[PDB]
Ligand SMILES: O=C(Nc1cccc(-c2nnn[nH]2)c1)c1cc(-n2cccn2)cc(C(F)(F)F)c1
């Protein structure tokens with residue numbers, strides 16, 4: 001069956017020229033709305049949530065882990081390092097790296113999280129341990145954002161990412177304090193006001209992680225507390241066939257607006 005919401009999302013997609021993937025979980029009734037929900041999309045920096053969450057899980061058996069220093073050397077800086085470049089020839093704690101990766105989208109900070117987990121496969125191993133059989137992280141920053149059509153590397157599906165984000169932020173994949181920490185970090189994101197948030201009523205509260213890359217890839221994953229109802233989890237992924245395409249945060253906002261109007 002195709003719903004009215006799905007027809008609206010298909011119209012939005014057709015007007016955009018690209019490929020749009022949406023998954024909503026409404027935690028009041030556990031129902032789901034999907035559009036291309038089982039197709040693969042490049043995650044880009046939305047993968048930083050899984051990396052930070054994997055380090056939070058390690059912290060549950062090491063009370064001092066988030067205070068642990070990690071060396072930032074000049075050779076470690078990559079292509080987008082707004083926080084890490086202030087700490088070159090110094091250190092950042094795993095908490096500081098997590099906050100930088102999530103709230104500022106710092107790519108050097110992400111690379112330190114991946115290294116703490118033993119490489120991209122250590123992030124995938126955590127995803128499997130929390131029931132996500134779809135997520136895969138194959139590369140470090142910045143090349144995990146190449147976003148080449150048909151490339152399986154560094155991809156997931158909307159359905160899988162929405163289920164995982166629900167389990168991490170609202171369910172019991174993390175201990176209570178760690179889940180609260182992840183929620184606090186997401187709610188303090190600096191990069192999201194033009195993406196999912198821009199399609200939602202202003203009274204609703206959002207925590208989110210954005211991503212973008214080549215092929216005009218533009219992504220956002222969010223946990224949403226709407227006024228007067230239980231939380232929603234929403235993933236909006238978008239990628240374009242035209243390699244030099246501009247990113248389209250407004251398409252993510254428009255998908256969120258359609259979803260909100262359908263509730
Ligand atoms: O910094 C970024 N992108 C980046 C960084 C370094 C190199 C290149 C690149 N390499 N080759 N060509 N461009 C691109 C970047 C982009 C966006 N964004 C643009 C459109 C939609 N979202 C948002 C953010 C932020 F959320 F963090 F704020 C960072």
Ligand SMILES: O=C(Nc1cccc(-c2nnn[nH]2)c1)c1cc(-n2cccn2)cc(C(F)(F)F)c1
Pocket residue numbers: 045079080105106107142143144145146147191210211212213214215216
């Ligand atoms: O690293 C990147 N982008 C980035 C960096 C930091 C934060 C964010 C972000 N966060 N939230 N939204 N965007 C995005 C990035 C971007 C591009 N690119 C090419 C055309 C447009 N883009 C290519 C590459 C790669 F060639 F190396 F693969 C990496």
